[PDB]
């Protein structure tokens, strides 16, 4: 059980490290997404102002 | 292997001169640090002990090890800088071995010249 | 002095009931927490507190040790059974804190 | 026994896994065992089960244990000092405060209704602040008892002096 | 020890390793859903203010 037990440890540690990295990956990706989904809101509001500026 | 040529998994290699004090450490570890140890042992020429552990509880196991006196370090040699670690350690130990010899030869030369003179 | 004496008795009973509740909470929390650490699973742990009749403490301590001690592990198991309340020696008194001996399963002995 | 005197109810707190089995009586459940088997069937077993709180991490679990051990001692030091005083004065029983009712309910019964009591403590607070909170309350209450007792001795000194002037 | 003792300690271990990982990761992505709302609102509100 010497290398079976160590095998258990080694595999668990790879698996923990990867789940936590997946949540960290998720945070990076959401902050970039925030930067993206704010870029969309700006130019729909600007063209709204362009539309009623054209009425003048 | 395939993890202890890096810093992915944590191992604590160490020498101890009492398997008796090692027993005492297993009880301690277990009470306050749970069963995150896997304990393996080999009889050496000392005793080779090994505790194996996570990478964020590293310092916690060390305190315990320190207090009962063991050489439990995460890597016990500093020659490391070639991959795998053991190749650098073997070349340094080939330099060490001849460097003591050369010293002895020098010691001898001076003993022959000056014992009578002394 | 007279004001101080009445204030002193009233205060001490009121403070005593609150500290009793506080103390047992740390003992409840602690035993649960220590179980969670040493055993892991199951996530809910079976905690009971046993009120022992006077002079049957020695018998109680032994029967639980025999029965449950095996779960903690053979390394964990030490024999130094018995109890000395006189100051003639300081062996024979369990506590995980000391290296002299250890409890072999999560057990605290509470003496009021 | 005869190496120790007891005349008041004594307690042992155990916690065990819920999958456990006794090997002193194989074929028994732990709960069934406590009542029937344990010390000649004369054990009184009381409920003491509490649920999950919020645990920081595994990492945090370690820090919590260490503190718990320490705060448990400290509260224990305080409660002993309060009892020693009440006993010392002999204006309240010396023969109780080992099985003296808390919330006017006998002590083994009090523990039986103890399931995690609420005074200011809830199961939706974090465990680190419950360890801290509790200890702060205990230290305040004891420091109060110590000050009033301190004052009571300075008052005894003054009453003896004054009396001596009045006829000594 | 016993082989049996050692295997219970091996299951317990992987349980502890797993516990640490869900519990930390669960926290990190919840804070990130909150960062998203605040941050996105903030960038837009600045630029619309300029557009006005």
Query: Bridge partners of E16?
Result: none
Q: Which of D1, D11, D79 to mutate to test the interface with C (most CBs of C within 10 A)?
A: D11
| DSSP code per residue over D61-100 | HHHHHHHHHHHHHHHHHHHHHHHHHHHHHTSS-SS-SSS-
| DSSP code per residue over chain E | --HHHHHHHHHHHHHHHHHHHHHHHHHHHHHHHHHHHHHHHHHHHHHHHHH-
- Which structural domain range is residue D55 located in? 50-168
Cβ contact B–D (≥3 pairs, < 8 Å): yes
Of the candidates D23, D97, D137, the beta carbon closest to that of C67 is on D23
Tokens describing residue C80: 């130094």
CA dihedral A20, A25, A26, A29 (to 10 degrees): 170
Instruction: For chain D, list the strands marked E by DSSP.
Output: 10-16, 44-47
- All residues of chain C having their beta carbon less than 8 Å from the beta carbon of residue D62 are 37
- All residues of chain B having their beta carbon less than 8 Å from the beta carbon of residue D62 are 32-33, 57, 60
Tokens describing residue B118: 């002394």
Cβ contact D–E (≥3 pairs, < 8 Å): yes
- Specify the CATH number for the domain of residue D125: 1.20.1460.10
- All residues of chain E having their beta carbon less than 8 Å from the beta carbon of residue A49 are 51-52
CA distances from A28 to C32, C67, D63, E25, E28 (A): 37, 53, 30, 13, 11
Task: Give the contacts of D62 (CB within 8 A, at least 6 positions apart).
Answer: B32, B33, B57, B60, C37
Chains that touch E (3 or more CB pairs under 8 A): A, B, C, D
CA distances from C5 to C2, C9, D95, D157 (A): 5, 6, 20, 14
Task: Give the contacts of C92 (CB within 8 A, at least 6 positions apart).
Answer: C80, C81, C82, C83, C84
C99 at D interface, C-beta within 8 A: no
Q: For chain E, how many residues are written?
A: 52
Decide if C73 and E19 are in contact by the 8 Å CB cutoff: no
Contact B26, E6 (CB under 8 A): no
Q: At what angle do helices B19-33 and D58-89 cross, to 10 degrees?
A: 80
Tokens describing residue C48: 């009971």
C101 at D interface, C-beta within 8 A: no
Could you give the 3-state DSSP secondary structure of residue B11? strand
Breaks (C-N over 2.5 A) in chain D follow: none
Residue whose C-alpha is closest to residue D19's, from C15, B81, B76, C68: C68
Structure's resolution in angstroms: 8.3
Q: Taking the CB of residue B75, how many other CB atoms lie within 10 A of it? A: 14
The continuous run of DSSP H or E covering B14 comes out as strand B10-16
Residue whose C-alpha is closest to residue C12's, from D160, B106, D97, D60: D97
Alpha-helical regions (H) of chain B: 19-33, 58-66, 85-114
Q: What letter does residue D52 receive in the DSSP assignment?
A: -
D114 at C interface, C-beta within 8 A: yes
Reading phi first (left if > 0) and then psi (alpha if -120 to 50, else beta), residue D90 is in: left
């Amino acid at each position: 059980s010497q290398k079976n037990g160590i095998a258990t440890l080694l595999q668990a540690e790879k698996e923990a490290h990867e789940i936590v990295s997946k949540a960290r990956k998720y945070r990076q990706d959401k902050l970039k997404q925030a930067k993206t989904d704010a870029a969309k809101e700006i130019d729909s509001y600007k063209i709204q102002k362009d539309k009623e500026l054209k009425e003048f | 292997i395939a993890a202890a040529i890096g810093a992915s998994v944590n191992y604590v290699t160490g020498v101890i001169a009492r398997d008796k004090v090692a027993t005492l450490e297993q009880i301690l570890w277990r009470v306050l640090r749970g069963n995150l140890f896997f304990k393996t042992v080999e009889i050496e020429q000392n005793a080779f002990i090994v505790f194996s552990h996570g990478d964020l509880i590293i310092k916690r196991i060390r305190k315990i090890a320190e207090s009962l006196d063991a050489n439990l370090y995460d890597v016990d040699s500093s020659n490391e800088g070639r991959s795998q670690q053991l190749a650098k350690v073997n070349k340094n130990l080939s330099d060490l071995y001849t460097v003591l010899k050369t010293t002895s030869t020098t010691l001898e030369s001076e003993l022959y010249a000056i014992a009578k003179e002394l | 002095e007279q004001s101080l004496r009445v204030q002193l008795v009233r205060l001490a009973k009121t403070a005593y009931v609150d500290v009793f509740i506080n103390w047992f909470h740390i003992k409840a929390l602690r035993v649960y927490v220590e179980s969670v650490l040493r055993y892991g699973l199951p996530p809910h742990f079976n905690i009971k507190i046993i009120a022992v009749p006077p002079k049957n403490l020695s018998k109680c301590k032994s029967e639980l040790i025999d029965a449950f001690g095996f779960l903690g592990g053979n390394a964990f198991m030490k024999d130094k059974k018995g109890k000395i309340n006189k100051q003639d020696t300081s062996l024979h008194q369990y506590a995980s804190l000391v290296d002299t001996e250890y409890e072999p399963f999560v057990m605290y002995i509470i003496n009021l | 026994m005869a190496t120790a005197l007891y005349t008041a109810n004594d307690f042992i707190l155990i916690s065990l896994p819920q999958n456990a089995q006794p090997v002193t009586a194989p074929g028994s459940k732990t709960d069934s065992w406590f009542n029937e088997t344990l010390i000649g069937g004369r054990a009184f077993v009381s409920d003491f089960k509490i649920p999950e709180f919020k645990i920081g991490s595994l990492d945090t679990l370690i820090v919590e244990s260490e503190e718990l051990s320490k705060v448990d001692n400290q509260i224990g030091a305080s409660i002993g000092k309060i009892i020693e005083i009440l006993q010392g004065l002999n204006e309240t029983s010396t023969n109780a405060y080992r099985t003296l009712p808390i919330n006017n309910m006998p002590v083994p019964e009090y523990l039986e209704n103890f399931q995690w009591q609420t005074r200011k403590f809830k199961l939706d607070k974090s465990i680190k602040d419950l360890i801290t909170l509790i200890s702060n309350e205990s230290s305040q209450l004891d420091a109060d008892v110590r000050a009033t007792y301190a004052n009571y001795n300075s008052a005894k000194t003054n009453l003896a002096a004054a009396e001596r002037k009045k006829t000594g | 020890l016993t082989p049996n003792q050692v295997n219970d300690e091996l299951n317990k271990m992987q349980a502890f390793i797993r516990k640490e990982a869900e519990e930390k990761a669960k926290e990190i992505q919840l804070k990130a859903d909150q960062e998203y709302e605040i941050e996105k609102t903030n960038i837009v509100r600045n630029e619309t203010n300029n557009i006005d």
